[PDB]
Amino acid sequence: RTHSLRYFRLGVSDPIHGVPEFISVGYVDSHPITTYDSVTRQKEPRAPWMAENLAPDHWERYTQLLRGWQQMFKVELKRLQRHYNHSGSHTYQRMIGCELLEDGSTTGFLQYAYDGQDFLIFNKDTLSWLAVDNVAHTIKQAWEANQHELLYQKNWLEEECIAWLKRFLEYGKDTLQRTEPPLVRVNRKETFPGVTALFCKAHGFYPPEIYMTWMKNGEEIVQEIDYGDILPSGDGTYQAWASIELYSCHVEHSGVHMVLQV
Amino acid sequence: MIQRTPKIQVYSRHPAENGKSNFLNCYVSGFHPSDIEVDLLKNGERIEKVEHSDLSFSKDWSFYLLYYTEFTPTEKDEYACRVNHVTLSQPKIVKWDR
Numbered sequence: 188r189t190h191s192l193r194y195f196r197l198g199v200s201d202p203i204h205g206v207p208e209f210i211s212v213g214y215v216d217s218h219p220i221t222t223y224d225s226v227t228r229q230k231e232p233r234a235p236w237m238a239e240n241l242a243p244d245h246w247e248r249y250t251q252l253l254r255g256w257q258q259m260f261k262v263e264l265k266r267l268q269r270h271y272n273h274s275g276s277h278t279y280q281r282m283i284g285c286e287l288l289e290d291g292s293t294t295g296f297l298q299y300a301y302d303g304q305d306f307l308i309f310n311k312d313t314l315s316w317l318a319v320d321n322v323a324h325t326i327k328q329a330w331e332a333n334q335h336e337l338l339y340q341k342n343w344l345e346e347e348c349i350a351w352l353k354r355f356l357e358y359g360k361d362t363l364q365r366t367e368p369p370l371v372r373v374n375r376k377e378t379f380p381g382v383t384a385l386f387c388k389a390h391g392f393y394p395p396e397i398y399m400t401w402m403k404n405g406e407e408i409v410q411e412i413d414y415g416d417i418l419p420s421g422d423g424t425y426q427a428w429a430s431i432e433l434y435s436c437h438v439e440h441s442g443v444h445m446v447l448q449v
Numbered sequence: 450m451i452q453r454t455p456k457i458q459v460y461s462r463h464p465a466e467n468g469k470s471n472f473l474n475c476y477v478s479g480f481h482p483s484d485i486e487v488d489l490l491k492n493g494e495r496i497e498k499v500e501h502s503d504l505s506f507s508k509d510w511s512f513y514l515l516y517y518t519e520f521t522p523t524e525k526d527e528y529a530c531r532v533n534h535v536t537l538s539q540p541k542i543v544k545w546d547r
């Protein structure tokens with residue numbers, strides 16, 4: 188069972204809308220677990236299984252930390268805007284986190300982005316920054332000069348982050364380690380004149396890892412399969428589509444192979 | 450400068466069957482920057498009672514939101530969603546397929 192812990196930061200230059208200049212959100216596998224904004228200036232627990240169970244000192248302290256980070260992130264953004272010489276609204280994004288696999292392999296990541304494009308990518312194995320432009324190189328030398336920070340980041344991504352992830356995983360086992368079976372239903376729809384399209388849908392399942400395929404006479408799968416997306420249903424489960432132009436629907440979820448005939 | 454056009458997806462939570470408890474969802478994803486305008490519509494008139502999940506982030510520096518509202522399906526009525534982004538010159542309206 189693969190799991191992922193990630194933290195996102197967003198800084199907007201001149202919001203020109205009453206929306207937060209800085210927003211910070213934490214995720215444990217596409218689940219909101221923590222949130223912060225420059226307007227509220229207080230860290231709030233999104234998930235219920237960590238709202239009362241986790242100690243209050245955590246939010247108390249990390250709020251002050253976030254307040255500190257906000258200003259730094261602003262300075263970094265404005266400095267880059269001074270390097271490119273732009274006026275207006277520009278976005279500065281940061282991602283940091285780890286990944287725990289089935290076997291137990293650890294994989295960490297740290298990235299910085301400007302205007303929705305990769306700006307600086309951190310590699311912990313060689314302790315180096317990957318720059319895309321000369322401006323990125325300019326911030327690259329200044330960041331690489333300070334080796335203490337690099338080493339800290341490495342040990343954080345490799346040990347500390349995994350620890351946090353394990354802790355969070357144990358707090359909400361009934362939610363994150365829960366298994367809900369999908370309701371599979373087959374629907375016939377005529378879009379073009381004469382062309383009859385067969386749809387297969389799955390509603391209400393967790394985790395989102397699901398496999399779908401259309402079979403002819405239950406022996407051969409077809410290459411004309413149009414796949415959709417694993418969409419959130421709203422209640423906390425997911426939903427997915429599989430369509431083909433015209434015999435059997437095959438959905439595999441949590442080791443269960445489901446077959447439907449038309 | 451690099452920006453992305455939003456992908457609008459309108460669908461129901463539970464399987465479509467008229468005269469029952471259901472939820473209409475509009476998934477707006479893969480867009481950049483963050484500033485958007487989203488409104489759900491019922492035969493043209495906007496729905497006020499609509500809740501939305503706060504801004505969410507993705508690995509490819511794109512964002513995604515979910516706008517949902519409770520509804521009862523009926524064959525007479527048709528539902529849609531109006532989305533306006535900076536990339537969009539005219540507010541894109543996507544209808545529910547049923």
Ligand SMILES: *[C@@H](C)/C=N/c1c(NC[C@H](O)[C@H](O)[C@H](O)CO)[nH]c(=O)[nH]c1=O
Nearest residue numbers: 194195196211212213221223249283343
């Ligand atoms: C509270 C748990 C919010 N944390 C948070 C973090 N946390 C990771 C880490 O402590 C931090 O990045 C340090 O600077 C070390 O890398 N990161 C983030 O970007 N936003 C948050 O709200």
